[PDB]
């Protein structure tokens, strides 16, 4: 039984949340913000990601070089990432270097220069990033997947933004973005590892007390997405591996079906020919795929947002003449979540998940990421006892009912990249979303 | 029938003193009248091989055993088409009639049957 | 980690307050002890195959019911087999390790169909990074055998079932086995190991065939899949100052979208290249390496010159600021290594299997500017520099150019 | 061979009393002059492809009507294109060479479909012999660039059509071309070359990018296709005594089913290994090599030790008998080299292009025992020994062991 | 008919002043009424390709020309099935209607025809 997550607020409405571990000697402190690319419009799309670059380009006190030196002298590192709904800025350090790291984070968030010279310099760096994501096939597939599933909607936009915006982003719009979005009621200061909660609250009172509050404070993790059944094909005969994602509209963080969708996802599970144990997994799809050499890997996913989600599978295969079989067998395993699953699969998946949700948190950065994610999506850290109860409440009837309303005979978003000549047209893929025998 | 079945039932009989006393002599005569040794076959050469399990067991034979099996099958086919029987050293002597394939097929089937069982497990 | 002994097996455990326990068997069976090339990698991959009590299939299906996970890796010193599970499932995992060490059926079909193909995919994934190849090549040049043996199984030298069975006969013995339990109650682990590993052979300590000898040289691995260059300096007397020097020279950035304030980091300005200084202590010898990867052989060559200059410059004078920065970066690196389960297990494994007491991160020595500059000076003035070039090797530097 | 000049092209011809003539164009375009790795091999393979006057197809069909044959090879110094035909067909062959040098259409499809695949089969056939690989590897270590460039095109460094077209623009020029006619009336050849090669560019002398630099070292090529080991010694001042020393040390047997009386031959007794000492003069540097192939790496290692000893022993004393044996074996080797049309062409080609007056076999110098022992002493005590191991390289010797 | 034939006859006409004066304007109107440019095709995209010679010529196209041809064929197929015509930049302008494939097929055919001739040579 893990130590209790302590939570305090400041007057502005900044949440401080901590989980101490007296067995480690490092600490991860950082700021989780309930804001990301989705908060941009079409004209300033790319701003949030642009700011992330400039946050490390110098503040009103420390220059770019001084910033570098200060962190080098601390001994640990700083890291940041911007997603569609969430931005994170954290610092991993030694136990007693925590006050330094909180001070640096407070500086780069509140007091960043955003100097025209630096805007202009990064504008090329970010332009080069547009032509090099092209290599990260999983990311290419998932970005096209969001773009098509949420066609012409904010969740459909990329994080980098269009080339056009990169050339026209000004310090004015950068400043406007972080003034509107980086408000105290949207921010959580998180500490995990060798942190004292009371010490962290004091550091918050010292550095984050002059943060603006938003005019209308909504609760943390407050949001209408209209999913489009659709396909993007990026055929490239020169690539040896096909990458395919298939998804349906999934569940939000606060859906009542959140755990049901996780259990369903665990019934299909993951597979990777490179891992020794994968040929012995219990999942039916795993057995079909491994026996017939249909794929190098597959990974089931259930991505959530504040008001929607995507539930589906990502496949990679070199078997270019049997892509049809791979997709066919995958979707017939999904059909069985509607028609055939019983207590046998459901209780097996529950067993696997009860551990999986706890195992994931195996270092201070993972713990901080868990506290930060849960605080910015649900408004609270959910105790493992509550999570164990919600998983236990999932029955086979719940899984069947969920799959019959979410998967069965529903539109999919489909992205294929690589040698995908063998991937059939939309109708034949979508026809596998039901079974004529049932 | 599975090789596993055949081997288990045979072991029940070989255990029982009474049963073995009456079955083993019959089985030996049966084998003599069967006449597969007169075409230079070993018993295991006759087992049906057009099955996933048997194809896997044959792929696991050591190369030497596999080359020798191919020759016995070719040689027996030549006796069959010529309507001749083996003579001399081509006749399989009882001491040469070794169960070279049985351990491989028993391992393949053990896994196949465990997989079937475990596909039907119920968390208690 | 309270070190004890249970039925002749050294057991170290540290209780914690988490629902998650990590149990690791550390074996003295890494590649420096390998009888034939690649055997320690193959033995690692043969863990959790069919045992006499429990098939590989049954083990995986039951592990899924506990939601446990399995991690294995081979180093130059150890084979590490780690399981991660919920605290309460400890007895199952102890018994699983016992079955692997006592009763593995090493069957030829497992080697051909399961073990060797997985070992081959493992290596191909690692080699996708040219820097991995360069640092492996550098150890091969520097040590030849022992530490110079390849860690991984290669196609040119095939491992046989008899090779693996012989090696396992040596390695899977009470004298070569240490049990390390993170977030495991120490008294409970001793009781379980004491019952489960009682009938394990005693065996004898596995030893390196031959003494560690140091050599200089060059390796020129021509690939078409990326470019890298290692500049290694073999160390005859491994000393803790080289950790501080590795962290000082640095190379990676401590901040997103930045180059960094470390000498080696500053050597990469204007280039799409990365650099990393590393120090490898192996008890009786050491290796100090600087690895540079990039897409341009011309840029790699450019950085390589600046890198060796940086080392020479350090041998001249270090500032007090820079020496303190080295202490801080080095304490941090020590702390995170003792946290990471993979490295943690091997650290206590080394303490248990050898007798090298672990240096706690809080006890990491602070080196003065004098001591750091002296360490860099010895390296700049090495008689046996090693250079491994990977990629367009005709365009990468040579040792005599550096 | 009467050396003359016809329209700016150096022509050497020797009339004889046979119905068969050999005409060879020797080009200063070998691999030491290469701009890109493998271009001289590709240019050699592009000879007698489609020209503007005559397609490759038409050429081959007409060559069959004359019963002529075509031979091409690349060295470190030259590209040699030789044709063998009946005496009377001389004008056709001269005109064919003119079409190749003046009017080759270097078409991309020829490179992809015809030229590069043939170049690749050429190399794979040569590499089937591990001794070829070892001696190639040794030149690469010893010289790095120039003489250290690979002779043959490899897959890792793709030659493009623009590479080959640029190189041909330099090489196919009056300044880089010599014509050598065996059993060709010298007056008739001059008249024909004078009309056919008149409109060839003059161009400029192709040169080696950079001076020849000597280096020592090791190369370790892992193959699964047999074992070999070269022990090379780079020579800064090439001297004719090394021919005598190569022939003295010997290695091959001079009669069937025997081992031989040469020091290196006697080093192989009790082993299924072969040995050959070779000396390569390249004008400005040289290479003295001893190559040992065999199926057993243990036996190769054994012979390698005895081989180095043999060289040291020679540096001590050679008897008068042995020095005379060296003169005899060396005169014979010279004579047969001037006879073989392949090597003959390059010998006069080197006299015509470079200016190195040929040494007639009857004018081969006799070296005293003093001069031979001094040459061997200078090799045993070299600062830059090269060792290239091919095969099971973990089991073959290293430079520092020898 | 072979591309070689078509090209040679065309060259005879283009040589003759009289002939070109009357044929070139006809050929230009023919091409306008043909309407292949309104589906974004270039003339050479229409040449029959299911022959050894044409398969070889297509394999010799530079990669970029080959990728662009694939796109024009796919785009034209989509216009055809939709019963639409190209608009704007999808219409092939006369200056873009380049004979990208003609040199490749003429080289393939030159060799094929020389091979046929030389297969029938008679030593005189």
Curated annotation (Swiss-Prot), chains B, E:
Gene3D superfamilies: Cytochrome b-c1 complex subunit 7. GO terms for cellular component: matrix side of mitochondrial inner membrane; respiratory chain complex III. It is found in: Mitochondrion inner membrane. Transmembrane segments: none annotated. One of its GO terms (biological process) is mitochondrial respiratory chain complex III assembly. The keyword Mitochondrion applies. Keywords: Electron transport, Membrane, Mitochondrion, Mitochondrion inner membrane, Respiratory chain, Transport. Its main location: mitochondrion. The keyword Mitochondrion applies. One of its GO terms (molecular function) is ubiquinol-cytochrome-c reductase activity. InterPro entries: QCR7, QCR7_sf. It is a peripheral membrane protein. Component of the ubiquinol-cytochrome c oxidoreductase (cytochrome b-c1 complex, complex III, CIII), a multisubunit enzyme composed of 3 respiratory subunits cytochrome b, cytochrome c1 and Rieske protein, 2 core protein subunits, and additional low-molecular weight protein subunits. The complex exists as an obligatory dimer and forms supercomplexes (SCs) in the inner mitochondrial membrane with cytochrome c oxidase (complex IV, CIV). Belongs to the UQCRB/QCR7 family. Component of the ubiquinol-cytochrome c oxidoreductase, a multisubunit transmembrane complex that is part of the mitochondrial electron transport chain which drives oxidative phosphorylation. This is Cytochrome b-c1 complex subunit 7. It comes from Yarrowia lipolytica (strain CLIB 122 / E 150).
Swiss-Prot record, chains C, D:
One of its GO terms (biological process) is mitochondrial electron transport, ubiquinol to cytochrome c. Keywords: Electron transport, Membrane, Mitochondrion, Mitochondrion inner membrane, Respiratory chain, Transit peptide, Transport. It is found in: Mitochondrion inner membrane. Gene3D superfamilies: Metalloenzyme, LuxS/M16 peptidase-like. InterPro entries: Metalloenz_LuxS/M16, MPP/UQCRC_Complex, Pept_M16_N, Pept_M16_Zn_BS, Peptidase_M16_C. It holds the Pfam family Peptidase_M16. Belongs to the peptidase M16 family. UQCRC2/QCR2 subfamily. This is Cytochrome b-c1 complex subunit 2, mitochondrial. It comes from Yarrowia lipolytica (strain CLIB 122 / E 150).
């Amino acid at each position: 039984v893990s130590p209790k997550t302590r939570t305090s607020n400041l007057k502005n409405g900044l949440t401080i949340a901590s989980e101490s571990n007296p067995l480690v000697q490092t600490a991860t402190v950082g700021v989780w913000i309930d804001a990301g690319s989705r908060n941009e419009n079409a004209y300033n799309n790319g701003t949030a990601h642009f700011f992330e670059h400039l946050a490390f380009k110098g503040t009103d006190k420390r220059s770019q070089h001084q910033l570098e030196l200060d962190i080098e002298n601390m001994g640990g590192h700083l890291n940041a990432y911007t997603s569609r709904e969430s931005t994170v800025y954290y610092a991993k350090s030694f136990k007693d270097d925590v006050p330094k790291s909180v001070e640096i984070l407070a500086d780069i968030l509140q007091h960043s220069k955003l100097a025209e010279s630096a805007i202009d310099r990064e504008r090329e760096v970010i332009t080069r990033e547009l032509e090099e994501v092209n290599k990260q096939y999983e990311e290419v597939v998932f970005d096209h997947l969001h773009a098509t599933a949420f066609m012409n909607q904010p969740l459909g936009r990329t994080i980098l933004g269009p080339r056009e915006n990169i050339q026209t982003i000004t310090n004015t719009e950068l400043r406007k973005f972080i003034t509107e979005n980086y408000t105290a009621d949207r921010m959580v200061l998180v500490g995990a590892g060798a942190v004292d909660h009371d010490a962290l609250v004091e550091l918050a009172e010292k550095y984050f007390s002059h943060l603006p509050s938003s005019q209308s404070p909504v609760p943390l993790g407050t949001p209408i997405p209209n999913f489009v059944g659709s396909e993007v094909r990026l055929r490239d005969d020169t690539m040896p591996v096909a990458h395919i994602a298939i998804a349906v509209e999934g569940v939000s963080w606060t859906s009542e079906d959140y755990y049901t969708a996780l259990v369903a996802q665990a019934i299909i599970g993951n597979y990777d020919r490179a891992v020794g144990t994968s040929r012995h997994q219990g999942s039916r799809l795993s057995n079909i795929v491994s026996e017939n050499n249909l794929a190098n890997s597959f990974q089931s996913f259930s991505t959530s947002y504040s008001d929607t989600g995507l539930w589906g599978i990502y496949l990679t295969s070199e078997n270019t003449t049997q892509i049809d079989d791979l997709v066919h067998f995958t979707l017939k395993e999904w059909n069985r979540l509607s028609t055939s699953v019983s207590n046998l699969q459901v209780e097996r998946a529950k067993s696997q998940l009860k551990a999986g949700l706890l195992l994931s948190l195996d270092g201070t950065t993972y713990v901080a990421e868990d506290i930060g994610r849960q605080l910015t999506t649900l408004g609270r850290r959910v105790t493992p006892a509550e999570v164990e109860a919600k998983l236990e409440a999932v029955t086979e009837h719940d899984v069947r009912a969920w799959a019959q309303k979410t998967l069965y005979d529903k539109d999919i978003a489909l992205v294929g990249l690589g040698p995908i000549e063998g991937l059939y047209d939309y109708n034949r893929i979508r026809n596998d979303m039901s079974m004529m025998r049932w | 029938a599975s090789i596993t079945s055949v081997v288990k039932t045979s072991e029940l009989i070989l255990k029982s003193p009474l049963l073995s006393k009456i079955v083993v002599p019959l089985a030996k005569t049966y084998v003599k009248f069967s006449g597969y040794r007169q075409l230079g076959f070993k018993m295991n050469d006759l087992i049906i091989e057009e099955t996933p399990n048997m194809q896997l067991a044959l792929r696991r034979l050591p190369p030497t055993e596999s080359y020798d099996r191919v020759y016995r099958l070719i040689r027996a086919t030549q006796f069959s088409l010529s309507h001749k029987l083996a003579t001399g050293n081509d006749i399989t002597k009882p001491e040469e009639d070794d169960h070279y394939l049985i351990p491989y097929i028993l391992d393949v089937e053990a896994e196949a049957f465990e997989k079937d069982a475990l596909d039907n497990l119920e968390v208690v | 980690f309270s070190t004890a002994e249970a039925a002749g097996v050294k057991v170290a455990a540290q209780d914690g307050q988490s629902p998650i326990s990590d149990l690791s068997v550390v074996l003295r069976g890494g590649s420096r002890y390998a009888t034939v090339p690649g055997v320690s990698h193959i033995l690692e991959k043969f863990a959790f195959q069919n045992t006499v009590p429990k098939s590989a299939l049954r083990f995986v299906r039951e592990l899924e019911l506990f939601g446990g996970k399995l991690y294995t890796h081979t180093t130059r010193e150890h084979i590490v087999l780690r399981t991660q599970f919920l605290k309460q499932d400890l007895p199952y995992f102890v018994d699983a390790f016992a079955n692997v060490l006592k009763e593995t059926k090493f069957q030829q079909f497992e080697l051909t169909e399961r073990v060797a193909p997985v070992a081959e995919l493992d290596l191909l994934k690692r080699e996708s990074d040219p820097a991995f190849t360069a640092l492996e090549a550098a150890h091969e040049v520097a040590f030849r055998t022992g530490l110079g043996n390849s860690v991984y199984a290669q196609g040119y030298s095939p491992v046989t079932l008899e090779d693996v069975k012989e090696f396992a006969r040596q390695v899977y013995a009470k004298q070569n086995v240490a049990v390390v339990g993170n977030n495991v109650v120490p008294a409970d682990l001793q009781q379980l190991v004491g019952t489960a590993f009682a009938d394990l052979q005693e065996g004898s300590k596995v030893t390196q065939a031959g003494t560690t000898t140091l050599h200089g040289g060059e390796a020129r691995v021509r690939t078409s899949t990326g470019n890298a260059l290692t500049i290694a300096l073999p160390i005859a007397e491994p000393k803790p100052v080289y950790h501080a020097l590795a962290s000082f020279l640095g190379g990676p950035a401590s901040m997103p979208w930045s180059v960094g304030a470390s000498p080696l980091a500053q050597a990469t300005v204007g280039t799409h290249t990365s650099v990393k200084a590393t120090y490898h202590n192996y008890g009786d010898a050491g290796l100090f390496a600087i690895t540079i990867k990039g897409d341009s052989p011309a840029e790699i060559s450019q950085v390589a010159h600046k890198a060796v200059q940086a080392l020479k410059d350090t041998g001249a004078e270090v500032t007090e600021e820079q020496a303190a920065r080295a202490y801080a970066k080095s304490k941090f690196a020590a702390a995170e290594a003792f946290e990471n389960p993979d490295s943690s297990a091997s650290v206590i494994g080394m303490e248990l299997l050898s007798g090298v007491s672990r240096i706690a991160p809080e006890n990491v020595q602070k080196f003065t500017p004098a001591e750091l500059s002296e360490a860099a000076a010895q390296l700049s003035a090495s008689a046996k520099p090693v250079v491994a070039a990977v990629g367009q090797v005709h365009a990468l530097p040579f040792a005599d150019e550096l």
